[PDB]
Amino acid sequence: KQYDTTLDLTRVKPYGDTMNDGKVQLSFTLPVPDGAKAVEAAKQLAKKMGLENPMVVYHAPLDKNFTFFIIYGSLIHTVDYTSIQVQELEIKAMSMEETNEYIKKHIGRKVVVVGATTGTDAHTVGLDAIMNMKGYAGHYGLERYEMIEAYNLGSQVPNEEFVKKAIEVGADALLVSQTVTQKDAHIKNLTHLVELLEAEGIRDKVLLICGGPRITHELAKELGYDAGFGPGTFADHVATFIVTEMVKRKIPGLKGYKK
Amino acid sequence: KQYDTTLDLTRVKPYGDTMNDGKVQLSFTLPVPDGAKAVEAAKQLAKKMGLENPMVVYHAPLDKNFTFFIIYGSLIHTVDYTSI
Amino acid sequence: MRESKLNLDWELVDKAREAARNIVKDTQKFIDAHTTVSVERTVCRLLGIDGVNDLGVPLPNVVVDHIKSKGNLSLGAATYIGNAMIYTGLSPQEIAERVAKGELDLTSIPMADLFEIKLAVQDIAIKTVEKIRENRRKREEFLKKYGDKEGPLLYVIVATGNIYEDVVQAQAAARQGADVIAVIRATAQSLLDYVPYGPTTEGFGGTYATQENFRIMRKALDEVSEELGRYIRLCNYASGLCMPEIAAMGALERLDVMLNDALYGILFRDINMKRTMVDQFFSRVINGFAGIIINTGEDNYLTTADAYEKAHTVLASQLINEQFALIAGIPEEQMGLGHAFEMNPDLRNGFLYELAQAQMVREIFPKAPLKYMPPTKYMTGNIFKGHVQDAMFNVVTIMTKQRIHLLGMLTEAIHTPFMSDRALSIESAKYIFNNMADIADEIYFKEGGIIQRRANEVLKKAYELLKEIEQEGLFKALEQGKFADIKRPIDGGKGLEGVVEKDPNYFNPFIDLMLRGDRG
Amino acid sequence: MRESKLNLDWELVDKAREAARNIVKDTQKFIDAHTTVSVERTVCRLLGIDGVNDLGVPLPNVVVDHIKSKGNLSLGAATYIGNAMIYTGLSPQEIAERVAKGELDLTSIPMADLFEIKLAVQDIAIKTVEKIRENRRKREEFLKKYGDKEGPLLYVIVATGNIYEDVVQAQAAARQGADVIAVIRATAQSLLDYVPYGPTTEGFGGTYATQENFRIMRKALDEVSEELGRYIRLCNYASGLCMPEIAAMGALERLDVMLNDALYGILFRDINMKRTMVDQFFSRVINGFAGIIINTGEDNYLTTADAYEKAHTVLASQLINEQFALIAGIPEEQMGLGHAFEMNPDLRNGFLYELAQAQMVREIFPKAPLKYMPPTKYMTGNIFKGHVQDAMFNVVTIMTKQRIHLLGMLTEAIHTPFMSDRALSIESAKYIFNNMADIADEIYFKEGGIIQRRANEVLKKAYELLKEIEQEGLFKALEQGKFADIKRPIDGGKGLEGVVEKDPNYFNPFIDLMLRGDRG
């Protein structure tokens, strides 16, 4: 065509079938009855979103007052792929033997980890993958690590029980499991745990790790945690981060240092 | 969760599980290799598209230079249904 | 001889059934000689006690706590309630109110002859039994009037946490092709030792199971059934430390289905096994009398263990649950034994294995309204491949005639369903069930093929596991972590302090009424 | 042994096959007595003539137009080319160039003895035939080196319109998992009476079928197949006014698949019936010698007609096409007869009828690389239900063992596929083909059931239609609109002027060389 363009990494926009067409798909419900007014409202909402020249390919009523739409449209906005600052979750993992050697050489003593699915949450499959020595897809857990004493407290653990057990066992790092952001109780529970640790005064003496199927590093750092892990994490990543951070910031730990 | 939960026909916005959550779904392809930078680029594109706290649920490679995304997130914008 | 497509070994099935029967005999030896506090609170609720005191604790809780701390709870709450009825001459609810306010002390009244106490309580027992029976009659009348389906019953869950938005979206789904509506319970209600009071507009992960919520949702679904001309069922969960209480509340509010399994509680909520077994007996007696279909939860085993390696565990658990239900008096027509379409989607010939297992379950339990539930473990963020996996789930449901169909959702791995996700799931299921309406009666299987061999392999493994569990006993087998690969100590968990030993003069009017009224 | 899952009536199938054979014999009586200008142009191309003149008219067109206007084309272009070669001593390309420039006149040269002309032309015909045989050997060597698949072959389409973007998309799709790539042809080229020269950079709705484009696509696919370790087939469309020329160009450029069907052109493009039949005979002869898999377009009947009512039409068309191919010399392993999954999704037991028809087709043609094609008529903007329908289509494909599988897209009714849509379709097809791999060997059908009765019904209706067509004649039946509810007159349509009658001394060496070559 006369005015078609080539790729530009500073102005990347979606790709339906041509380099810079920017075609997008989206679906949503509206609390209005079906009709031509509903279609016009959806089109106006799509135009306000950014999709210039939208086209409603589907619309059907779910109820007497609800309609479900599907829209395809050409976008206007562009993102700059070269200046993106990414997130702070980039990490690479050393092997188990390397972790043991690092702990022996630098710290000189075993690292204690206490993990639990605090709050009312019941799931333990991810935390058992990370902790349990059986491993997950060939990645052995923290319990297997020779120089790591890992405790698995299960689920439905109250925060008070968690902090009390951490103090009793002399924990150097604490792990907390949660679930997707559509669970909104995870934020409140994590904030409550942080407040409890601050009140106890043990916050500075231990690390904090929070993860889950859709936890992210940005949210973890916003809450006050020291890290955040999502899907695809394996025990070697966690062990590497714990050892490296412990040596970098010289966490004293609670081992033989009860409050 | 939202402060407003009663339907107002001057400010109708998408519907998820509650009245005014404004949840939307959208899928697109990007001509950049799959990775963490691609996920951040998709999130930034969605945010400038008008979605708060976009959450990429899927991301896969189609080829060595193309990635396919699925994104969910609330929508800021509202449309007046009465004036149309 | 029984007809089969898998050429099942029926002698082996008979031996597995006998092993499960003997397991249940051994376990019931203990259950007969014990009772829990929840059973006593349920007796109080059935006798007419309800409401809350100033502090917000229900009155059954107050009465049972008073009897336990001040007196001998091994005599049962019925003994003391009836004695107070003879003494003061009031009704059980008035006595509970007086105790709550502090104007009466049940354990200080002189104890009358037990025969007179039984006579005093019998009338109220009969009245409550008759109310439950009339509810059963009304449900049967509704089903007869509107007619009943012949294919699967679509089963959707509403979980917004607000009772009224739950009503709105339940009516919306019922107006769509949904046949059974389940209101998933609020997270951390199984841990409570009391049943809340009144309607709730708040809840994290679900809605609280209260009697007023039951009444509200029953009214809404009755109105929608009148509108649509077909009967919409109501489902709830009788798990937790208050299992018999919720069973009684559902029986009184005319729920049509109820999720009643103790192994789920023990393995996934960490409740004591003795507590849960003793609760489960009474709750299943109530559900059997009330006409409710009890649903078990062997689907949950596969989310922790491996589905191909530990498939026989589901069958063994199903046989044990069948025998428990039979001892409680539940007929096969009310035994909704559950299994799930839960193998790896990257497994070659995985569809043949799931089909073989579903057909074997459909053949061992021919009368049961078997429940089939969607894939959950291997669901990812690809909503489109998820729709495809759900389509294969529906295909297996229609090819092997499963009675109840728990609809899988486009976005299981992401969040609880939207309105649109439920609409899409219902639409896909209706499409597939209409196109293959009569595929079950057409397709047969090669003699000696993959399907027959898989079925016989799973059956043999289940029989061996049942013999092992019979040798040790159910409690020991649970201790060694054979179901769901979860090891649970016998004396651990929550609620062991609620278990008590029956006195030689223990009195519970309702067991005999509910076990002989249904039989004669 | 003729083993059948549908208990077919083999006597009825034999009678239908005999009826199709007789119809094709009657039609062939006419074909053998005529030749078209397109056939002469194909002969000229196979002799070596290629290029364009000063005005852009392809050189074969100029040569054939010259012989037609000035001389007598009934003799055949080969006669004139050979006479010119003897008289002047120049090669065919130089003779054609001189004729275009006007420096030579074919009709002014005295005619020599036919024996010398035949020898001179055969000298080059043998070389061209040997080159085509070399391409066949090369294709077989690639297939042997990489090994061949055992399941269905995924078939995708790329329609950018620019050859290089087509190459990029085809390589990406092959890396994604496609086994066959088809470049949809530019719209309104089937009406064109010449084949462009050189590459094309722009087109509407597709890419032109030119020799240079075939060469470029073949190079790209060869490189990608070497990269991937498996063979990627290349497909293109022959039907049109220049059908034999495109067939020959594909044979020279080593195309693995080719859509070759006269009835499609006759009905859906309004091309004259005699022209299309005469073109089809030679094009199928070339395709059969070259080793190309020829596909037929019975899918198009259902889009303009009703699937349930008009399945016998598809079966009768398939039998007629099979007989036409057999007379053209194409073996059974190269007859990719096509059918589609185009029934109404709202039809109860529709999947059973689709399965019965697919299995009947798989049974009547046990050796053909049958082609199964997606639903297109009953698609909408609901991409999710589109994905579900495609999944059911894949289920049918795997359960009936269809060799080639034209992937459908969830966005069939909206636009031409995106890259992501193709990726999703391939992923779904892979999943379903892996899970149900050995389902064809397992599932049988109930004797006398719905599937068997449906198959027998369709077979008998096809037999009756074939008897009617035998009684009337193929041309009259085409005039009566029996095949797609479209009535095209015998003497109407485009291209009638191009038909010619063979002189008694008509000469064409390629027919003899390619018909006798396969027999050793």
Ligand code: B12
């Ligand atoms: C298994 C499961 C269950 C099982 C768990 C069994 C057990 N004992 O653990 C049971 C039956 C208990 C269950 C119940 C419920 N569940 Co559930 N369940 C699932 C399921 C199928 C899989 C989740 C899972 O663990 N995945 C497998 C693991 C390996 O992956 P993972 O979490 O990503 O873990 C990896 C990473 O995230 C990371 N990681 C995880 N944790 C941590 C922690 C740290 C510190 C670190 C460093 C890394 C890390 O590393 C891990 C290994 O790579 C999902 C659906 C799905 N397909 O995702 C629903 C799901 C999570 N559950 C859900 C819900 C709502 C519930 C309930 C709470 C509902 C209710 N009844 O009220 C119930 C009750 C449980 C409760 N009281 O909390 C929802 C949550 C959605 C939301 N609201 O945001 C889901 C998504 C299903 C749905 N859509 O409806 N569930």
Ligand SMILES: Cc1ncc(COP(=O)(O)O)c(/C=N/CCSC[C@H](N)C(=O)O)c1O
């Ligand atoms: C048998 C039985 N009885 C009672 C309850 C109620 O639980 P509770 O109120 O006591 O806490 C349940 C609950 N099952 C929730 C599984 S849903 C997770 C799924 N993988 C998804 O993807 O959604 C149960 O199975």
Ligand SMILES: C[C@H]1O[C@@H](n2cnc3c(N)ncnc32)[C@H](O)[C@@H]1O
């Ligand atoms: C919570 C209710 O729904 C079922 N539940 C919900 N989704 C799934 C799933 N995909 N797999 C297994 N069980 C599930 C439970 O068995 C119970 O009936």
